[PDB]
Each structure stands twice: as C-alpha cells, then as structure tokens.
Amino acid sequence: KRGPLAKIWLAAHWDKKLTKAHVFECNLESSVESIISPKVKMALRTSGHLLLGVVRIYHRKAKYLLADCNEAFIKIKMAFRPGILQENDFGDFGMDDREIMKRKLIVDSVKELDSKTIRAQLSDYSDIVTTLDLAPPTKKLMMWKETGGVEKLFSLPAQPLWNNRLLKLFTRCLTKRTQQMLHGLQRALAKTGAESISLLELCRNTNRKQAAAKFYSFLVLKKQQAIELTQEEPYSDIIATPGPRFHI
Amino acid sequence: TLFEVVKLGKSAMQSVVDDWIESYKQDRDIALLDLINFFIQCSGCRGTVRIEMFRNMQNAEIIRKMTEEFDEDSGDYPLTMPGPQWKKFRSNFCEFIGVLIRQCQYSIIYDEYMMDTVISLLTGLSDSQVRAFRHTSTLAAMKLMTALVNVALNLSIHQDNTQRQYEAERNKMIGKRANERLELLLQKRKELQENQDEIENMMNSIFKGIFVHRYRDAIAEIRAICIEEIGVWMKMYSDAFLNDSYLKYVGWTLHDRQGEVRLKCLKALQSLYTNRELFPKLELFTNRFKDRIVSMTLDKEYDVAVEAIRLVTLILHGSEEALSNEDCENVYHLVYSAHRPVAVAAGEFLHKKLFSRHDPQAEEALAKRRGRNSPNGNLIRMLVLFFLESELHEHAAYLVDSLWESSQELLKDWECMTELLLEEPVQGEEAMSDRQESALIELMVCTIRQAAEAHPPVGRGTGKRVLTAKERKTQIDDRNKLTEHFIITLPMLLSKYSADAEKVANLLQIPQYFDLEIYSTGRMEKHLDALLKQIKFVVEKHVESDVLEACSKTYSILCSEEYTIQNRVDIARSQLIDEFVDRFNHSVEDLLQEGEEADDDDIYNVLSTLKRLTSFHNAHDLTKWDLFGNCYRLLKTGIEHGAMPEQIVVQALQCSHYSILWQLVKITDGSPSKEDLLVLRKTVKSFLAVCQQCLSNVNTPVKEQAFMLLCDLLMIFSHQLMTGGREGLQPLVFNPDTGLQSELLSFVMDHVFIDQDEENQSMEGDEEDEANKIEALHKRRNLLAAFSKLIIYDIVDMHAAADIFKHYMKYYNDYGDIIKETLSKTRQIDKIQCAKTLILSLQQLFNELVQEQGPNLDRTSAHVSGIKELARRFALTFGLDQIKTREAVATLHKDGIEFAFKYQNQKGQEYPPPNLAFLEVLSEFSSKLLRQDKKTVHSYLEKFLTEQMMERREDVWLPLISYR
Known part of the structure; x- marks a missing residue:
C-alpha cells in the first residue's frame, strides 16, 4: 500500500x-x-x-x-557456417434426477391603450422594419476587412509575406455456611459443656433432607480439621469433640 | 412564512403543497390566509394579511391598502430584482402554484370556496395600477388557469373513459349487477359533466376577467408571457383551444411594437406546428399571415428572424402552400446574411426545399444513393444553378457555410461531381458549361476548405472554438479521404483545365490542406511528380501574377522539409527555376542591348520570365542562382534610358528585394562573415539608390513600390535590429537621409492624404466595378500604415509625423484609425515628444489657417472650431494614463504659450499678439484636468505678457481670457 x-x-x-x-x-x-x-x-x-x-x-x-x-x-x-454415438450414457438412466412437489410610488394614469393606437398598429407597421445585412460579394472585401484594423495592420507587413520565417524577421522589429455451622457448634457446646456432640440429637426434630445436610456439615467440618469425630462400631451415633481449629 | 419557506430553499415543493392541503382540510380560513399572504409577499408588499381583515372586508380595499402599505425601500419588485436567489424564487413560486392547484383536482377543487376569493383578488390586482401587483397577479392567476386547463384535460379524458364504459355496458344487457354498474357509470358521467361545467365557469371567468384586459396592457412582458403560454396550451390542449376564438388574440398581437412580444408570438406559432401535423385551421392562419411571417423574417431582432425562418421551415414541413417564389428568393438572399445563425437556418430551409431529385425526404434505398454513380448529380446541378443565379456573391463561401451542417453527407461525395466535371457521365446530359465549370470549381474550393478548417469566415468568426474528439477524428479521416481522392483527380483535372487561369488558381488552394506523410504511406509520389510536371506546363503556359502567386504558395506548402518528399519536390523546383534562369539570361542579354528593336516579343519574354522568377523567389530561397547582376543591370538601364515598360521594372525591383531579404535570411543563421557582409551592404546601398530614383520617377505605381521597398529596407536596418542578441550586424546599419525623408513626406502627402477628386493622384472609382474607390483607399491606408510603422520604431523623424497627426479631422473616415493608433503608439514610445509633436500638429494647422485667412484668423469659422475639437479629443487622450503624466502636459502648455507669443504685431498694436487664437486651442488642454501645475503654467504664461496686456479685456484678446 x-x-x-x-x-x-x-x-x-x-x-x-x-x-x-x-x-x-x-x-x-x-x-x-x-x-x-x-x-x-x-x-x-x-x-x-x-x-x-x-x-x-x-x-x-x-x-x-x-x-x-x-x-x-x-x-x-x-x-x-556458410559451409455415431460413441461416448454417452445408457439412455438417460444415469441422468434422470426428477422434479418433486410628494409620493414617489408608481401611479399609472392610463393602463390600457385606446382603439386608435390599435388601429394605427394594424394599419401601419413599417416603422419597426429593417431589410438585411448583406454579406460582401467579393473575396477582396474579406482580405480588406480581416486586415481592416490598426491592431492588425500595424503588426503585418504592407506586402504579404508568404514565408513565416520572413514574418519572424518582420516581428523582430516589433516591440459462608461453614462459619455458620462452626458458630452453631460453638453455642451447641456451651449449652452442655460435656465435649461430646451427638449427631442424632441435632436431627431429633427435623426431616430427612436437613438431617443429611447436617451429616455432610459434620463431614466438611471434619475435612477442615476443626473437629474430631469418633465412631467405632459399624452402626452408632457419631461423637464430635472440639479439634485444634475449633475457634473456641 | 410560506413566502420565506418557498423562497429560502424549499427541500420538496410537493411537501409544502401537501402541508397546505392538510392545513386546508384542517381549516379553510387559515390556509386561505397563508396562501394570500404568500401571494402578497410574492408581490413585493411587506404587509401581512390578518384573519379578520381577510375574512370580512373586501378585496378591492385590500388592494388599495396594500398599495398604501407597500412599504418599499426601492422600486424593484421580486420579478425583476438581479438574478439567482430571486430567479429560483420565481421558479419555486410558479411551481408552487402549479403543483398546489393540480394536486387538488380530484376532491378539493369542487368545494367552490377558494377560487372565488383567489380569482377576485388576482383579477383586481391585475387591474391594479401598480406594475408589481399587475405582473405578480397575472403570473399567479395565469399558472392557476393553466393548471385549470390541465384539470379540464383530465376531466375530458375521464369523460371519454366513462362514455366508453357506458357504451360497453350498453352492448351487454345481461346481468343485474351489470345494470347497477351502468347506473354507477351514468352517475360518474354526470358528476364529470358538472365538474367540467364548473371548470368551464372558472375558465371563462378568469379568461374574460384577466386575459382580455392584459393582452391590451401597456407592459410588453405581460403580453409576451401570455402569448408564449397560450401557444404552449394550444400545443398541448388542441381539443378546445384550436379555433379562431383564441387565434384572434394571436393575430392582433402579431403586430406588436416590441421585439420580445413578437418573439413569443413566433414561438407560439411554432408550438402550433411542433410537433404534430396536420390541421386545417393552422393552414388557414398560415395563409392569412404569410405576409406577416415574411415581415418577421426581416425583423430588426436576429432572434425574431431566426424564429420566423424556423416557422417557415415548419410550414414547409406541413403546408408547402403559403410561401411564394419571391419569398423563397428573399430567404435565398438571407442565406447571405452576415449573422451566421440566420444564414444557417436559411440554408437548412433551402436544403429541405430544393433537394428532391431522388430523396423524397423519406426512408433510404432510393434517397441517399441508388447504388450507382448517378442519382446525386441533379442535387449538384441545382447547386451549380443556384450559385449561377446568386449574383449577390462571386464566391459561394457564405452559401456553403450556411449549407455545411445541413448537407454534411452530400458535400463529401466529391467523386460524383468529379465525374460530372471531367469524364462525361452516362446520364446523357449536355456539355458541362465553362461558367458552370468555374461555378462548380468555386463550390469545391469552398466545400473542401471548410472540410479542412472548420472555422467560419470573417464576420461569422467567433474565436471561442473548442474541438471535441468526434470533431477532430472527422477532420482527420476527412483529410485522409480528400488526400487519397484528390491526388488521383487533380492530374486529369489539370489536363482538362490547364489553360484556365482562374480555375488553376482556385484548384491550387486545396494542397495547403494535404497531409504529406500520407504520400509516404500511400506511395503516390509518382502522381505528385505528374502533377508537378502538369503545373510546370501551366506555369510555362501562363503569365498571370495571381496564378504564379498560387503556384509559388503551393510549392512552399509542398516544400515542407519535415516530410520525406522534400528532396523529390526540390528536384522539380530546381529544374524549373534553372530553366527560368537560362531563359532569363538568354532574353536579358539581348534585351539590354538596343539592337532591333527591342520589339514587343522580347519585352514579353523578359517580363514573363521575370514575373515567374520573382513569384517563385518570394516563397523560396533561390539566391544560389545570383541573378541580381541581371536585375541590377536592368534597373540601371531603366534609370539611364527610362523608355521601357513599367511591369518589367516592378518585377526587377521586387526580385532584387527578394534576393536581398533571402540573403538576409542566411546571415542570422549563427554564421556571419564579413566580406560578404560588406558586399551585401554595398548591394543594398545600390538598391537604395535605385529605389530613390524610382521614387523620383514620374510613374506613380513605381513611386508606391519604391516607397514600400524603401520601407522594407529601413525596417531591415532599423534600431530594433539590435534587439535579437546581435553583434556583427552593426556595420550593416544604415541611417536615413534627411533629403530622402523629405521626399518620403512629400510623396505621402501628395499620394495618401487625399479625400477629393481634385488631386487626380487617386483613381476614379465612381462606377461600382472592380476598379472602385475602395481599392485605392485601402492601398493608401496600407502605404500610410507602412510609413507610420517606420515612424513608431525610432527610424524616421516623427516631426514629419506631426503633419500626419494634424490630419485627424480632415481624414477621420479614411485614416483616423491610423492617425489615432500612431498617436497612441508614439505616446507609448515617448509621451513628452508625442505631446510636443501633437502641439506642433496644431501649430501647423494654425499656420495653414494663418496663410489661408490672415491675422484676423476668422476665430468663429469652422476651421477654428475643428481645431478646438481636435484639441478637446487630444486633451482627453492625455491625463493620468502613462508615465510623466503632467510633465508632457506642462511641456505641451509651454510650447503652446511659446507659439502664441512667437510673433509680434507690427501695427495695431504692439501688445496684441499674433497667433493669439492658439490660446483657445491650449485652453482645452488646460480645462480642469490638472490643478497644482496650473499655477506653474500660468507663471510661464505671464512671462510673455505685460500688465497692459493684463488689463485689456476685449474680443481680440478673448483667446487669452479663455486660456487664463
């Protein structure tokens, strides 16, 4: 570009x-x-x-x-050194894709001419007539007219100069919800102070869904290493006690 | 502000038309008020119509009030103020009326509300005494009724359609719904009938209230506009307007005393012919006013003449009845008009009229050419006959120029009249007459010269010509075809017409327009050489000066060194001039000796040979054959003896001058020697002595030729020879002789400044023949022009030209242009000395008055009045125009004061000055042009005066009083 x-x-x-x-x-x-x-x-x-x-x-x-x-x-x-049908298709079977569906203002005393002027115009109209501007009949009249003029005649020689070079010689002389569950456990511990939280106690008066949510809450709190949960036999309640990061 | 909105750049005129329509549908009163206000402020009245004053009190007193409340700052009105902004204002005004009235033609125009007030106000203002109101109202109601005419046309078409459908139903009686459609069509037809009746009512009202009053109006432009537009209507609506009921106004208005009204009448009449034929009433009016039409063909205005010729052409299209043969010959003389458009229109009419041999002004296959070399012959034939009968011209230049564009295809068919000139065609016609031959040759001269150069001749010239591509390509291939055609035709053309001097002179102007490189491409230099031998035969057979000039010019054209053929032509040129050199030497060496006798045969041979040599030496450098010895011997024996023919001396002098100037050509070539320089100066000095003797010789054309040769010699050795960067030409420079200058002045005064038949130095010219007074007058003007050209270029003393300047009133018609130009140029060369010689001219005239009448001088006679008028035009020739403006005036005043007191009176009394009447001459130069130098000029004047001269105040010293 x-x-x-x-x-x-x-x-x-x-x-x-x-x-x-x-x-x-x-x-x-x-x-x-x-x-x-x-x-x-x-x-x-x-x-x-x-x-x-x-x-x-x-x-x-x-x-x-x-x-x-x-x-x-x-x-x-x-x-x-001087020293017939040759190359086709079988019918159209190969080719059959088918179709589908004082005051100075102008004051005129007279505004219309009388009939006398009209009748004079009709009778005589020779006062506004010329004849012709005839062209000059002869060629010499042209070569005097186009040389007619001092603006030209003073800039052309008296004799015609047929050579332009002679004319040059002539013109030479021109010049978070994690925290919520943590705090809920913080008050849950203080009510009893027996350092053992029961999972089943918290879900005594709730449905299945919130009980499962509480179980997963204990799980995730165990994950964050804030709490210690004990369960020994295959089926019992889970005992939760404060861990290192319990926040008291 | 509808006036301002329409005026100041309306974006869409139909938009504000629809705005007015919407406002009218909203409320009729406010829209009517807006339209009236628009019309009033379009009339130039700055007053504004109000609601109550429009609604209650009538239109005539409204007109009176707005006449009182026009509130002008100038007499101009918006129809005549300068141009642009107001021109588009007027156009928007007319278009607003037209679109507004035409758009409402369907439902609004039958409410019978707006048109009553509009018609009343516009009719009253058209009857108003104010020119502005009359013009504006006439235009407004005029566009109104034009739109109403269009509405009437639409209603007539609708009536035709509903009548056709009514008849179509009346064919078919089957169907109850068909009968209901028939009743609906009948109701529609009755509605259109009553609408047409209403439109006719307002048509008749507007017509009889406005047009009848205003075609008799004292204003020319109102009548002109009305007639132009009525012709427009009668062109477009010929259903009701094509009758004598409207043609009576046109017939009465055709005799108008103003050119523009008659121009519009002719435009209307052409609008009756353009573009449909035929109607019987049109031909009736044409036969009624054929005399008025041919009167307008010779009208003062060129436009009216052009329109009348075009109307005649339209009649020839339509009628071919009213025009007479004397009218035809009148237009044939109009073909020779000085004004080119009039002549071209007349020529187009002539081509349309008198060319119907095989062209029926219809389709082809028989109209242009019948495939043969014969049909177009008769068109050529009445071209020849027309040139024969047209005795108002010896040349068809104006006729061909008029017939140029109309007959372009016919004028290039040169081969046709070529066989109808030379080789006796198979048409069985008579012999091609010699007068007809010369006429056809002149026609060919005209046609091919207009084919080469497209500019019209002098008088028809414009100088503002531009060449388009089509123009130039037509010019070029035209040049090609004429070149290839006429290189063939000119050999046997000359072979048929070798002895005809004027025909050869006519035929040898075309080779100035031949592209010579086509010969190199066409390989037709052999035909060139054949024509060279043929024209050599003509040259050796003819002795006429004109044909020798034509031949020499033709050779100079074909002596173009830029083309390859220059050697080939130079062969023939050298051959022929060598023959003429040998013949001249053989004839001169026996003529110069007395012997026996010399008889007329040797005189004729010498004169013819020297004529040919001089003619071919003008245009060609032939100084390699130094015949200045023979010519100078002939001139010196003409000086000594003096008893031998004039023309031989004229040819010898001109040939010697040609040799001298051709030698002058080959010294500015950058290689000047000195021996041949002094030799040439000595030969020029001998030629100067011979020319001075011939000027002293009693023969007057010899005197004029010697004068012009001396003019050429002096301008060769003029002061401007040193302008072009020359050094070694200074020895060549020769100063004029004072006695020779006095001889030149005496010759000029005896043979130039003559305006009566008493001198008998000018040939008669009383009979209107070729020897008219105009030839002598133009020759004397040429001699005076040569003398003044010597004067103005610092060659000869211009105090002699003071005697030429003094003849400005005695020879105003003859040489006033030359005297004025010479005075202007000498003013531009040295204004102080120009003024000194001007007051010297006045002194010379005054001294001639002193000689003629004495010291009383007849101060109230025509001589003193003419001298004072010359002083007035000389004083207005001065002023603040060039350098040393008042210094030249002061010098002129000092010279006039010196001349006024140059001579003192011997008796009665000592203090009265002779030549005091020159102070009247100088008083025109004092006047009031200056003011500060007047004190100095008066101080110079009072030196020659005394207190006794101061105190006396009478008739003798009235020039002194008038000067002071």
Whole structure:
C-alpha cells in the first residue's frame, strides 16, 4: 500500500500482485535485512512475516537469475557456417434426477391603450422594419476587412509575406455456611459443656433432607480439621469433640 | 412564512403543497390566509394579511391598502430584482402554484370556496395600477388557469373513459349487477359533466376577467408571457383551444411594437406546428399571415428572424402552400446574411426545399444513393444553378457555410461531381458549361476548405472554438479521404483545365490542406511528380501574377522539409527555376542591348520570365542562382534610358528585394562573415539608390513600390535590429537621409492624404466595378500604415509625423484609425515628444489657417472650431494614463504659450499678439484636468505678457481670457 516495506507486506501476505520489475531491482536484500535487524517495537509474528517476504524475494531472484542463465545458454550456442454415438450414457438412466412437489410610488394614469393606437398598429407597421445585412460579394472585401484594423495592420507587413520565417524577421522589429455451622457448634457446646456432640440429637426434630445436610456439615467440618469425630462400631451415633481449629 | 419557506430553499415543493392541503382540510380560513399572504409577499408588499381583515372586508380595499402599505425601500419588485436567489424564487413560486392547484383536482377543487376569493383578488390586482401587483397577479392567476386547463384535460379524458364504459355496458344487457354498474357509470358521467361545467365557469371567468384586459396592457412582458403560454396550451390542449376564438388574440398581437412580444408570438406559432401535423385551421392562419411571417423574417431582432425562418421551415414541413417564389428568393438572399445563425437556418430551409431529385425526404434505398454513380448529380446541378443565379456573391463561401451542417453527407461525395466535371457521365446530359465549370470549381474550393478548417469566415468568426474528439477524428479521416481522392483527380483535372487561369488558381488552394506523410504511406509520389510536371506546363503556359502567386504558395506548402518528399519536390523546383534562369539570361542579354528593336516579343519574354522568377523567389530561397547582376543591370538601364515598360521594372525591383531579404535570411543563421557582409551592404546601398530614383520617377505605381521597398529596407536596418542578441550586424546599419525623408513626406502627402477628386493622384472609382474607390483607399491606408510603422520604431523623424497627426479631422473616415493608433503608439514610445509633436500638429494647422485667412484668423469659422475639437479629443487622450503624466502636459502648455507669443504685431498694436487664437486651442488642454501645475503654467504664461496686456479685456484678446 505505502512504505519501503510495503512490497515485503505484499510478498508475505498477498504474493499475487508482485511482478518481475519489483523482483529484479527495487531493493537490495542485504540492505533491507540490516534495516529490519535493529528496529524497535517489532512483534514476533510480524518479524516472521518479514522473514517470509525476504526469503520469498531472495528465492525469486535465484529463480529469475537461473532463467537469465537459461536464455544466456540459448544465445551462446548459436553460430554461422556458410559451409455415431460413441461416448454417452445408457439412455438417460444415469441422468434422470426428477422434479418433486410628494409620493414617489408608481401611479399609472392610463393602463390600457385606446382603439386608435390599435388601429394605427394594424394599419401601419413599417416603422419597426429593417431589410438585411448583406454579406460582401467579393473575396477582396474579406482580405480588406480581416486586415481592416490598426491592431492588425500595424503588426503585418504592407506586402504579404508568404514565408513565416520572413514574418519572424518582420516581428523582430516589433516591440459462608461453614462459619455458620462452626458458630452453631460453638453455642451447641456451651449449652452442655460435656465435649461430646451427638449427631442424632441435632436431627431429633427435623426431616430427612436437613438431617443429611447436617451429616455432610459434620463431614466438611471434619475435612477442615476443626473437629474430631469418633465412631467405632459399624452402626452408632457419631461423637464430635472440639479439634485444634475449633475457634473456641 | 410560506413566502420565506418557498423562497429560502424549499427541500420538496410537493411537501409544502401537501402541508397546505392538510392545513386546508384542517381549516379553510387559515390556509386561505397563508396562501394570500404568500401571494402578497410574492408581490413585493411587506404587509401581512390578518384573519379578520381577510375574512370580512373586501378585496378591492385590500388592494388599495396594500398599495398604501407597500412599504418599499426601492422600486424593484421580486420579478425583476438581479438574478439567482430571486430567479429560483420565481421558479419555486410558479411551481408552487402549479403543483398546489393540480394536486387538488380530484376532491378539493369542487368545494367552490377558494377560487372565488383567489380569482377576485388576482383579477383586481391585475387591474391594479401598480406594475408589481399587475405582473405578480397575472403570473399567479395565469399558472392557476393553466393548471385549470390541465384539470379540464383530465376531466375530458375521464369523460371519454366513462362514455366508453357506458357504451360497453350498453352492448351487454345481461346481468343485474351489470345494470347497477351502468347506473354507477351514468352517475360518474354526470358528476364529470358538472365538474367540467364548473371548470368551464372558472375558465371563462378568469379568461374574460384577466386575459382580455392584459393582452391590451401597456407592459410588453405581460403580453409576451401570455402569448408564449397560450401557444404552449394550444400545443398541448388542441381539443378546445384550436379555433379562431383564441387565434384572434394571436393575430392582433402579431403586430406588436416590441421585439420580445413578437418573439413569443413566433414561438407560439411554432408550438402550433411542433410537433404534430396536420390541421386545417393552422393552414388557414398560415395563409392569412404569410405576409406577416415574411415581415418577421426581416425583423430588426436576429432572434425574431431566426424564429420566423424556423416557422417557415415548419410550414414547409406541413403546408408547402403559403410561401411564394419571391419569398423563397428573399430567404435565398438571407442565406447571405452576415449573422451566421440566420444564414444557417436559411440554408437548412433551402436544403429541405430544393433537394428532391431522388430523396423524397423519406426512408433510404432510393434517397441517399441508388447504388450507382448517378442519382446525386441533379442535387449538384441545382447547386451549380443556384450559385449561377446568386449574383449577390462571386464566391459561394457564405452559401456553403450556411449549407455545411445541413448537407454534411452530400458535400463529401466529391467523386460524383468529379465525374460530372471531367469524364462525361452516362446520364446523357449536355456539355458541362465553362461558367458552370468555374461555378462548380468555386463550390469545391469552398466545400473542401471548410472540410479542412472548420472555422467560419470573417464576420461569422467567433474565436471561442473548442474541438471535441468526434470533431477532430472527422477532420482527420476527412483529410485522409480528400488526400487519397484528390491526388488521383487533380492530374486529369489539370489536363482538362490547364489553360484556365482562374480555375488553376482556385484548384491550387486545396494542397495547403494535404497531409504529406500520407504520400509516404500511400506511395503516390509518382502522381505528385505528374502533377508537378502538369503545373510546370501551366506555369510555362501562363503569365498571370495571381496564378504564379498560387503556384509559388503551393510549392512552399509542398516544400515542407519535415516530410520525406522534400528532396523529390526540390528536384522539380530546381529544374524549373534553372530553366527560368537560362531563359532569363538568354532574353536579358539581348534585351539590354538596343539592337532591333527591342520589339514587343522580347519585352514579353523578359517580363514573363521575370514575373515567374520573382513569384517563385518570394516563397523560396533561390539566391544560389545570383541573378541580381541581371536585375541590377536592368534597373540601371531603366534609370539611364527610362523608355521601357513599367511591369518589367516592378518585377526587377521586387526580385532584387527578394534576393536581398533571402540573403538576409542566411546571415542570422549563427554564421556571419564579413566580406560578404560588406558586399551585401554595398548591394543594398545600390538598391537604395535605385529605389530613390524610382521614387523620383514620374510613374506613380513605381513611386508606391519604391516607397514600400524603401520601407522594407529601413525596417531591415532599423534600431530594433539590435534587439535579437546581435553583434556583427552593426556595420550593416544604415541611417536615413534627411533629403530622402523629405521626399518620403512629400510623396505621402501628395499620394495618401487625399479625400477629393481634385488631386487626380487617386483613381476614379465612381462606377461600382472592380476598379472602385475602395481599392485605392485601402492601398493608401496600407502605404500610410507602412510609413507610420517606420515612424513608431525610432527610424524616421516623427516631426514629419506631426503633419500626419494634424490630419485627424480632415481624414477621420479614411485614416483616423491610423492617425489615432500612431498617436497612441508614439505616446507609448515617448509621451513628452508625442505631446510636443501633437502641439506642433496644431501649430501647423494654425499656420495653414494663418496663410489661408490672415491675422484676423476668422476665430468663429469652422476651421477654428475643428481645431478646438481636435484639441478637446487630444486633451482627453492625455491625463493620468502613462508615465510623466503632467510633465508632457506642462511641456505641451509651454510650447503652446511659446507659439502664441512667437510673433509680434507690427501695427495695431504692439501688445496684441499674433497667433493669439492658439490660446483657445491650449485652453482645452488646460480645462480642469490638472490643478497644482496650473499655477506653474500660468507663471510661464505671464512671462510673455505685460500688465497692459493684463488689463485689456476685449474680443481680440478673448483667446487669452479663455486660456487664463
């Protein structure tokens, strides 16, 4: 589009608009590589594209120079020594896709002419008539009229000068809910203080869903290492006692 | 502010028309008030109509009040103020009326409310004495009734459709619903009938209330606009307006005393012909006013003449009845009009009329050409006959120019009249007459020169010509076809017409327009050489100066070194001039000796050979054959003897001058020598002596030729020779001789400044023949122009030109242009010396008055009055126009004061100055142009005066009083 590197943009990206004129001599490769080496703000991928451009144009110079060497090869070798129905378908069965469904204002004392003026106009109208402007009959009248004038006659010789060079000589003289359950256990412990919380006691007067929620609450509180839960036989109530991170 | 909205750039006119329609449907009173206010402020009245004053009190007193309340700052009204903003204002005004009235034609226009008040107010204002109100109201009601005419046309079409459907139902009686449709169609037809009756009522009301009053109006533009638009209507609505009931106004208005009204009448009459034919009443009115139409063909205005010729052409399209043969010949003379559009219209009419040999003004296959070389012959034939009968011109230049664009295809068919000129066609016609031959050759000269150059001749010239691509390509291939055609035709053309001098002179102007490289491409240099031998035969067979000039010019055109053929043509040129050199030497070496006798045959041979040599030496450098020895020997024996023919001396002098100037050509070429420089100067000096002797010779054309040759010699050696960067030409420069200058002045005064038949130095010219007074007048103007050209370029003393400046009133019609231009140029060269020689001119005239009448001088005679008028136009020629504006005026005043007291009176008395009447001349130069230098000029004036001269105030010293 615009710029010394614009051709390299075309080479990297378009590559179709390139012609032989740009390929042969528009830029020196060794120049442009040292142009691009120290440039600031150079993104990695755009540098890769500029490498595409320079590699492409360098290889194109190699192909065109190979070509040049080829017509060199042709020019060096010369010397002079005087010394029915054939291909079809079976019917149309292969081809049968079928169709589907004081005052200064203007004051006029008289506004209409009388009939006397009208009758005079009808009777006589020769006062507004001319005849003709005849053209001059002869050619000499033209060569005096178009030479008629001191603006021309003082700038043309008395004798006609048929050569324009003589006219030049003439004119030469012209000038979070985790915390909620933790605090609920903090008040649950303080009511009894027997350091043993029963799971079944908390779910005495609740349904299945909130009981399961409480069970998972004890599970996740055990996960955070805030509480110690004991259960020994396969089926009994779970005994919960304060752990290290109980927060009292 | 509908006036301002319509005026100040309305985006869509139909939009505000629909806005007015919506406001009218909302309430009739407010929209009517807005429309009236729009019309009043369109009339230039700045007053504003109010609701109650519109509703209650009537329109006539409204007109009186707005006449009182016009509130002007100037007399202009919006129909005549400058242009742009107001021009588009007027266009928007007319379009607003038209669209507003036409859009309401379906339901609103039958309410019988707005049109009564609108018609009443517009009719009253059209009867109002104010020109602005009359014009604006006429235009407003005029567009109103035009729209009503359109509504009537639409109603007539609707009536035709409902009548057709009524008849269509009346064919088919089957169906009860069909009968109901029939009754609906009958009701619609009755509704359209009563609507048509209403439209006719307002039509008749507007017509008899406005148009009848205003076509008799004293304003030309109102009548012109009315007639133009009535022709527009009668073009578009010929159902009811195509009758004598409206043509009586047109017939009465055709005799108008104003050009624009008659122009609009002719436009209306053309609108009756354009673009449909035929009607019987149209032809009746055409036969009634054929005389008035041919009267308008010769009207003062060029536009009216053009429109009348176009109406005549329209009649020829339609009638071919009313026009007479004398009218036809009148238009044939109008073909020779100076004004090109009138002539071109007349020529188009002539082409339409008199060309029907095989063209029936219809389709092809028999109209352009019948496939043969014969049909178009008769068109050429009455072209030839028309040129023969048109004795108002010796040349068909204006006729061909008029017939150029109308007959473009016919005028390029050169081959047709080529066989009808040379090779006796198979048509069995008579012999091609010699007068007819010359007429056809002149026609060909005109047609092909207009084919090459497209500019019209002088008088028809414009100078504002631009070439389009189509124009230039037509020019180029036209040049190609004429070149290839006429390189073939000109050999046997000359072979048929070798002895005809004027026909050869006519035929050799075309080769100026031949592209010579086509010869290199066409390989027709052999035909070029054949024509060269043919024209060589003509040159050796003809002795006429004009045909030799034509041949020499033709050779110079074909001596174009930029083309390859230059060697090939230079062969023939060198051959022929070498023959003429040998013949000239053979004839001269026996003519110069007395012998026996010299007889008339040797004289004729010498004169003919020297004519040819001079003619071909003008345009061509032939100094390699130095015949200045023979020519100078002939000139010196003409000086010594003096008893031998004039024309030989004229040819010898001109040929020697041509040799001298051609030698002058090859010294500015950058290679000047010195020996040949002095040789050329000596030959020029000998030529100067010969020219001075010929100027002293008794023969007067020899005197004029010697004068112009001396003019050429002096301008060659003028002061401006040093302008073009030259150094070695200084030895060549030769100064004028004072005795020669006096001889030149005496010759100019005896042979130029003559306006009577008493001098007998000017040929008669009383009979209107080729030897008219105009030739002598133009020749004397040319000689005076050459003398003044020597004067203005620092060559000859211009105190001699003071005597030319003094003849500005005695020879105003003859040489006033030359005297005025010379005075202006000498003012531009040296204004101080120009004013000094101007007051010297006045002194010379005054001294001639002194000689003629004495010291009384007849101060009230026509001579003093003419001198004072010359002083007035000289004083207005000065002023603040150039450098040293008042210094030249002061010098002129000092010279006039010196001349006024130059001579002193011997008796009666000592203090009265002779030449005092020159102070009247100088008083025109004092006048009131200056003011500060007046004191200085009076101080200079009082040096020659005394107190006794101051105190006396009588008739003798009235010039002194008038000057002071």
